[PDB]
A paper describes a structure:
Here we report our attempts to design proteins with trefoil and pentafoil knotted topologies.
The crystal structures of kcTRP3d.1–3 validated the accuracies of the designed molecular models and their intended deeply knotted topologies. The tensile strength of this construct is considerably higher than other known purely alpha-helical domains such as spectrin (around 40–50 pN).
Residue numbers in the entry: 3 to 148
Write the structure that this text describes.
Amino acid sequence: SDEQRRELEEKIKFKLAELASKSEEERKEIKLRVIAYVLVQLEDLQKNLSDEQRRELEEKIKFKLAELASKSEEERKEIKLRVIAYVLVQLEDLQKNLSDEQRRELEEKIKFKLAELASKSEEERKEIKLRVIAYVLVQLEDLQKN
Ligand SMILES: [Cl-]
Ligand code: NA
């Protein structure tokens, strides 16, 4: 819906507003936490998905990454922030809708991905970030069909 689109835009920009007061060190940590969370959610979804469904989505990520290459650093920074805020919206929902147990394993699953991400080189680290941004833009584009 258009009225449904407008509500999600407000939420994204509202979430971004809480980011303005946080510090570059806090913001770096939030960015890294968001990435790790998208990664566990990615991994979990690849289990429950087909060999063909995994090819189709992998190419969806790549086509999205190609659109990003077409954009200016200003737009790319904007896009990066929208995705991060949109993920933070879900993390808010997630934080309310599950109890201390489900919260627990997720934190651990987050912690592993952060560990896995720290062990990577800088080129690969940058590559994972961008794929995570592209993937969220993918599912964001699917949801933005309703
Ligand atoms: Cl970026
Ligand atoms: Na690496």
